[PDB]
Structure formats: structure tokens, C-alpha cells
Amino acid sequence: GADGVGNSSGNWHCDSTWMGDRVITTSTRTWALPTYNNHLYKQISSQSGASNDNHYFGYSTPWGYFDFNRFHCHFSPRDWQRLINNNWGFRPKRLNFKLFNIQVKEVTQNDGTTTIANNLTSTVQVFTDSEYQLPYVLGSAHQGCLPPFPADVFMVPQYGYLTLNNGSQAVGRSSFYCLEYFPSQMLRTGNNFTFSYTFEDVPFHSSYAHSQSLDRLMNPLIDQYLYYLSKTNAPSGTTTMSRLQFSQAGASDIRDQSRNWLPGPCYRQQRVSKTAADNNNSDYSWTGATKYHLNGRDSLVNPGPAMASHKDDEEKYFPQSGVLIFGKQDSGKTNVDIEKVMITDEEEIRTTNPVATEQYGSVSTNLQSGNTQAATTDVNTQGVLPGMVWQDRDVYLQGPIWAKIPHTDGHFHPSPLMGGFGLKHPPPQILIKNTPVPANPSTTFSAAKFASFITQYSTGQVSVEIEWELQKENSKRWNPEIQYTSNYNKSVNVDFTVDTNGVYSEPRPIGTRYLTRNL
Amino acid sequence: GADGVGNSSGNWHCDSTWMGDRVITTSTRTWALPTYNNHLYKQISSQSGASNDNHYFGYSTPWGYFDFNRFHCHFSPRDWQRLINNNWGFRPKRLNFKLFNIQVKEVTQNDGTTTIANNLTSTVQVFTDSEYQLPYVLGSAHQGCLPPFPADVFMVPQYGYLTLNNGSQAVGRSSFYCLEYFPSQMLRTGNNFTFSYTFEDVPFHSSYAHSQSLDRLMNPLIDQYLYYLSKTNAPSGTTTMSRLQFSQAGASDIRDQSRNWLPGPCYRQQRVSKTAADNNNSDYSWTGATKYHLNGRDSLVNPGPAMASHKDDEEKYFPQSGVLIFGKQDSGKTNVDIEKVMITDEEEIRTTNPVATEQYGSVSTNLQSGNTQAATTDVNTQGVLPGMVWQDRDVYLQGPIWAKIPHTDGHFHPSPLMGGFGLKHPPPQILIKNTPVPANPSTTFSAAKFASFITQYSTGQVSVEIEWELQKENSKRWNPEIQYTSNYNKSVNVDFTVDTNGVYSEPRPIGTRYLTRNL
Amino acid sequence: PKRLNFKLFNIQVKEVTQNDGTTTIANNLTSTVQVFTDSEYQLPYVLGSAHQGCLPPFPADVFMVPQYGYLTLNNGSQAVGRSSFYCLEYFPSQMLRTGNNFTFSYTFEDVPFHSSYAHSQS
16 A cells, blocks of 8 residues: 555554454554664673673664553453453454554754654655564563553654673674664555464463362262271370271361372462561562572572462462562552552462462471381472373463463473463564664765764554454353452542543453353 | 153253353243142132221132243343343343143042052143233232242142222122133143243343433533523622523533433332431331322332432432332241341432432422512422433342233333333233042932042143343443452352252342443 | 263162151152263263262172262352352253163263383383
8 A cells, every 4th residue: 555645544443343252352553763772783781790690781773663462452441351251261363463654753953942844755664573583572571562541652662682691791602683684664654564464373361260179179978989098006005006097088088088180380489468567677589589590690580380379368478479560550660669569369270279388298208117207398399290280370451462482492381471372473573663864964975884864753553453262151150250340339530541630540450260160 | 742651741951042142041940739729719808807908809719820920030140140241131032831741649648647649640731821811910029930949849829810899899890710711731641731932022121221320411521502590680789689690501500501301200209228227216117108099099109110219328228118129038928127138229220210219309389570589399209201211120130020011091111110021912821720530429419519539739840941132232431340240258158059958049139230331 | 992882771760658667669650860961061070089889890789879069169168259059950951751761972082092011121
């Protein structure tokens, strides 16, 4: 599609369509793109005095990129409610992306007074990295996605990446990418850009909670035909003697029944309380944290493998670094109080996954004998074993959607730990840049590269449409289920609306696990 | 269908199927039918000392009848939740009824010891009153319907009716019906009985609440171009003078705007409080009640025309006789305390219908003049006016479904006041009776009618399947809606389940109006 | 395993009378039994917990059918809102009098062979 100056190159599409087992969400936003880095590539690195754990080396490019990797970019709160109250699972199917109504504007800063004017002949460059040749920076939970509220205008974030480093320096293996070394399409006002994408096959996300516990799967009315060791000594005349005795497990001793499965793996975290007085009076945010050690550096495990946030009757507690934490509206960046953030809770999976702040279990450490008593120890970290079952972390209305699976020789259960769908060929990155326009050149030749350009930026509309496949529930449960609902009581503001000043805000995080399912 | 003694004449069908805009509910129960009235018709009438308001005359027949005119006969609590959380309306479409696996058993009471045996040759008579020739006693909220829990066995209720009376006596116009004067099908063990029925066209029941008020439909930003009388006098020198002044209504005086519609009709009720101390210390249950006068008798208006139960911030109040009141499990019959009943609430319709315990409005009563001030009075009863709009009473999981519209010359908005669908040709009545089997007769002829029969009863299964048409919601609301949900907190029993003794109970009444709609 | 066939037949229903400490048992030719297979896995699956009540190993033994029951979520001795309750009468089931039978078939999915060997090397 291409036409003149006075022709819109696209329309505004924003709604959702529910049809059978599909739902199609399309959203449109308006964006603004500045000139980053003053048209330059720049090597960046960590500060000289930074600790060894915080060293890095990389580059920052003059390009921007579009990002729609959060659920609230596509679902309204009402649409999210429809989804989670009536379906056991869902997954993305295909995607459509469109960029249109480009406007480039030049700025003049004469005498502290700014004048903005159209530049009808300038252009922007766009290309999609459909072969995954650039370092993939999506899927790191960065800011700069499409806004949740359709009436908001957002700035396009700048592209940059990191490569191998040795302290603050680079090594011979580190690679540098010039994004101008890709074929890209140049658009003037009156051109548009589209492409399509098909998701690979992925398992449905489990939008349910189990109505049974992994340790409670037996018939409570019938005993087992297997025996377990129930007593190791028996009373003799005024004393005891070693004597093995066996029993069949029933309901009275349900903890001893033979079982076929084991709970999911574990990697223990430290426990903190939402009540301030319960926590220790010290700075253990890093010393008491759970981390992994890679190439001599320590890195915080956050949020880590999916484990239950707490056991029953203990909502006040949560793992130190084991849950997603969103910020309330207009909360700051650094060292905000607990009233400014929204802490998620993964308690629905405590039917199969162990609690994040307890041990996995206990194993024996010695060989008991006539003169040696049996001894056990706690297991604070347990890799996977044959016979384990578990659930993955839940997804949230304002959480990520997908993540690119790293191209490696091996990987196990490649669902991203922050939640979502792991894809070997995720939706490609979409890079965009204003073409530089040089200022008045000299009338005598000079071989030095240009350094004076016309100050300008661009704006336009972006739209993205995604088809999702649904998995309808088929329960024979008799009593009603738990549903997500709004409270009826009066209030000064309605949730998920704007306030008197025009600020849209999301008052709480919303998971997906409300319906139930048998184990 | 017909076969031997050792052949089941039907299977057990009980589940629900959701497909697009239809839902098909089928339920099966087992019933027991005694011998009523000892095989006789009997004239019945009110007691001689009864008050004039309680006089009646009629007959009781030896027949039983099947009744499935409550919603919980067809919907499980989980199915009811599905319905009310995702649809704006519904209505019945067609019906299937089946009676099978009949067993007749004879009882012998020798010496205080009861012996029960099969009687393979005895029969039962069944017929459906498909031409509406008998007095229609369904639709009066009587007990004896199919139980809500499928595992319960229920007794078939006895059939009886009332006709015209003059005090305790009858008149020449009163009519008597012999049910043996109908063609009926006789079933032995091994026969079954089926029929089908199609509902006439009826409007969908409104399963929504209005998200706007009838008096708040304007644009709050723009004034009207019409004027209203805003002041009738103006200040003169140290005094006032009559002087008419007019203004255009805006947001500051929103109560004065010109409007196109009026709230629904009214018939005022007395207000009582759920807090005991707020009510008067007297017996006003009948003296303070609202009633209608028909043929010299007073009859309580219950529940009457649909009006809101209370205004906002007043949940403690409810109209004396203006709401449906269900009883909790195992509550008594007479003079039970308020903790034993479940009082419904119709507050969702206060956007269009007036509050049941307030006046409809005020009208002027005189002609003001130089020496006469204007006077107004309250309107406690208001018939319908051109331009009125209103909502009908909600339906409940344990409330009635339909009612037969009386065959009269005229009627207005014939939706039954207890809630549900008004039908001119409702589902027909289904009468059933054990055929009498005479005992040992004398060996010499006697013309007197028989009076000694073999004591016996019957049992079997009954199934009913109904197709319902759904009306899906199509809202563009942004914020999430209110949904019916279970509470998550711990409890001794789960709602809508059985207790430790096996008693199924419904802990609260459940309406239909959770989704919202613009006015 | 590859495939499975199941059959239920020769049903007899008998009524008991306990008059005066003396028991009398008689046929009840018109009574019935209900049978259904949970072919969509909608009920809590209690098989596979090594419970008693299977078919006896010796073909000449007569066995009692075990009672069905299940557990759901609990908080101590109490339940929670998430716990679910199942009414088995809420399923379509076939009713059999003496003279009716009940059959169905089933095909196992693909599974690896069970290793009926021991390794002769370490």
C-alpha cells in the first residue's frame, strides 16, 4: 500500500472477538520515536568501580524497537475476566502486525522557542529480524511495551545489547552487530508496513487449580494391600527389644500410604513477612539471598523455579526472591516501601509443588545398628527425579507472554521461569529508526564524516492482532466454583479505570487459576 | 416400548450439555406413590369457624401429579453459575418427559409386622392434561417438586383443587371433575410412558442489571436547550414580589432536567428491619399488611408488583410482604425465627423501579394564587402511565419457572408476579394413580360398591429434559464485572453439598442478575 | 497391554427380611442396578493406590465390591472454597434388571514394554 500525503494509510482497529474456541484480540496505539544516540553506535560498559557481579560490556544502537510482550497489551480487564473464568487453558496461534500513518517532524530550537514542522520527504526505516540473527532482548521484562490503556501515547524504547566481557573489558569472542547491515524498508508519510507470523505448537497454559493434593489421592474407605514398617521395637519384661512390625495403611495413618508420584523439584528461598516487626533487623537482602554462580559471578535467582509461596494460614509470608512483584501506579524506581508494590502469590500450586521456604524433605545419612541410632537431614535443594510432577508459574494480566528458548545443546522443560510460553522461534524483533538528514554542508570537500544533522522525530500508529486458541472446561463438579469478581461496595474510584486526573491504574495483579480440576 | 418383567424400560439420564447458544439439561429422580384418599374423591371445605377471608370449597382426588416447576430441578449449582455469569438472557424451548421402571408393591400388616411383596400384574394409570381441561394447580409454589439433589427419593403429591364457594358452601356454578373421565394409559411393570412439548415464544428473562439509572441518562457536560421554572419570587425593596424566572438545566441542577421516561408502577408496602429492635412492638402482620379486596374477601399481596427492596445503604430493611422468602434446611413450618429463613433482595432493579416502601412521588392538590399557597401530596399507589419502563422480578435457583396465564378477556404484561415465564399453554399437568385392586369379595352378590382393597403402592423413575435458548452478552465495558463466586476461606462444610449426616442443603438464594447492561 | 474387554452379566437382586432375628432372602425381579464407566476421567481417580478389593486371584472365590470415596482439598480438618464435591447420580448410567448385561471396550495407549530382564553387565 502506498499513496499521497493526504491519505490515511490505515484505520484504527481495537477490539476482541470471541467465537467458539478462538478469541481474536486486536489493539492499536500511537507511538513517538526520537533520535537516539544522535545517530551513533556507542560501546558501553560497566563502571570501573563496580563490583565483579555487576560488570558488563556491550553496545547501544540508534534504533528503536516495538514490544508487545505483556498480556495487558492485548486483553482488557473485562476480556481477561472472560478468559480466566470459563477456560482451562489457552495459547497463541498466529499474529498480525501493522505500522501506518507515519509522520516525521523537524524541530527548530531558535532562541529557546521551539518550532515544530512537517518534513514530508524524510523517512523511517523498519525491518523485522525474521531469522533471529540479532541478540534477542525481548523476554527480559523490560519497560517500554504498548500501554495497557488504549488512549495512552508511548515512547519507543532504544535498542541495545550485551556481549561477552572480562571485567569491564571485552574479549576476542565478543561480537558487534551493525543494524544498518540488514535489508530494511524505508517509509515516507503515506507508506505502511505489515507482516504476519505463526506460533509454533506449545502446550496450553494451565488456567486451573487442582482440587486434589498430591499426597491425598487414595480411597479413604479401603486399606491398602501393601505393608509398611510401623514399629521397630516392642516391650519386653520392663524393657524393650528390637523387633520389626508391619501394618497396612488406612485412613487413620494416611501419611504412611504407598504412593506413585513425588512433588516437583525445589530450590529453597528465604522467608520474609509482610508485617515489618516479624523480620530480622539487619541487611540480608543480598547475603541471605539465593543465587547461582556462573563464571565467577553471583546472580540472584529471581523468581526461580515455581514453588508455592506459602503454606495454608500463612499469607503474611512470601519467599525473598521467589515471586513476581509489580509496582502500583506512579511508584518510584528505587527503595520504595511495601505499600507501593503488588506482590503476587502462587499458592494454587501447593497441591503439587513444595513450598518455596521449606525443605523438600528428609533423607537418612547413616546406617543404624545395635549401637548407632538412625539420623536424617533436610534436603534444601532437589533436582528432578523420575516420578515427579509439578505445575508451572502462573501468568498475569500485566506479566510477560513469551520468551525465546536459548539455542543450546540441551534444556529441560523449557518454559520460561517468569511465566509464559517458551518458543524456539518467537515473534521476531521489530526495529525502527529515523533516517538521518544532514544539515547544511560546507562548500569545500571534507572527508570527515558528518556530525551535524537536522533535529527531528517521528510518530504514527501501530496495531497488533493475535489469535488465541481456547480449551473449554468440562467439569462435573457439583458446587459452584471460585470466579474473579469485582467488589460491589462503594468506593471513590472504580478499579481499572481512570481517576479524576486522567491516570489509568491497575489496582491488583490478576492470575489465571480460578477454575478447578482433578489431579 | 414394552417388554417382560426382567427388562429395564429405561436408563438413567442426568447431565447438562452446553453447545453454542443452547443448553440441554436432563435430570432423573426416583419417586414413590402411595394410595391417596383410600381410592375416593372427597369434598373438602373450610372449617365452620374460619374467618371469611379463609373460606374455601373444593375436592381432593385419589390422583398424584408430577411437578418440576423449580429451577433447581434442572440446574446444578455449578450449571446455574455458568448460566448467570455469561449470559444476558435465557428461555425454555422444548421439553421431554419419561416415566419408566414401574414397580408395584403390596403391603401386608399382619400382627404389627409389615411384609412387602411384588405385585407383577397390578398397574398404574398415567395421563397428561394436554388440553388444559382440569384446574391448573401448578404455578402456586407448592412443595412436592423433584428434589434438587439427584440422590434423593421423593413422594408424589396429591392432586386437589378449589372451585367457587359462598362461605363454607358451594354454589350452582361450582364444577366437579372426575379424573377417571379422561383417557389414560395403564402401565404394568415393563411399560413406560413418554411425551414431548414445545414452549411458545416468550421474551428472554433479563439476567442483567442496569449500569445506568433512569434519572441519570443525560450528558453531564452539556446543558439542555429547554427551560424550567427555577424561581417564583424575586427580592424587592426589603421584601419580595411574585416573579417567574427560568433556567436551563445543567449538571449543577441535574434533578430539574427534562426527561423522556418515568419509573415503573408502584403499590406501597410496609417496611420492616432485620434488626429486631428497630421494629414496632405490636402485631401488625395483618393489620399493617397491603392487601386486595375481591368479592368481599381480603387477600395478602405477596409478593406483588416488582419494586426495589430498599434504597442504598439500607440492606437491613425489606418490604413486609414484597420479597420471596425461602427457608433454610430443616426449618419448621409455623412461626420460625428470622435466622431460619433466607430473604431475597431485589435491589438490582432500583435503577428503574421505585422502592417498595416509599411513595411513588408527589402531585399538586390545589390551585395556588395570591392568597393560596401550593400544596402537594404523596402518591402511594400509581397505575401504569404512557412512558413508564420497568424490570420484572428476578428468578432464583430454587424459585418457580413458569405459570399459566389465566384465560380471561384482558391482562396486562402477563409475567407471573412470583417471577418466571407466563405461558398461555404451559407444560401440561401429569396425573398418576395406582389402579385399585379389590380384596376378597363375598360369594353372594351385593350391589354396594367395594370398600376393601389390597394395600399397595408404587415406585419408579422419572426423567425430564429441557432445552434452553441462551442470549450471549456483547458488552464493551472495560472494567471487570461482578460474578457469582464461592468464598475461598476455610469452613466446616462446603456450600451446596451434603453434611456429615447426608443432608443436602442450599445455603443461600441465588439470583440471575450479575452482568450489566446500559439502560 | 494392548486392549481390554469388560462384561457384566447374570445380575440377581435379592431383598432381605430380618423378622424376629430370622433372615429370609428372596428374589426381587423388578429391582435394578445402575452401572456406568467414567470414560472421560471426570471423577477423582482412586484406582492405582494399591487398595484392596480387586478381583480375587483364585477363580473360585467370591468377592465383595468395594465402596467408592475420595478426598479433596483440606485445611486441617476443614475444607476450603476450592474443594469440589461430585454427585455420581449426575452421570448418565445404564439401569439393568435381571436379564440385562453391560459391556464395553478399551484400547491402551502406546507404552514402553516392561523390562522383564536383568542386565548381565555392570
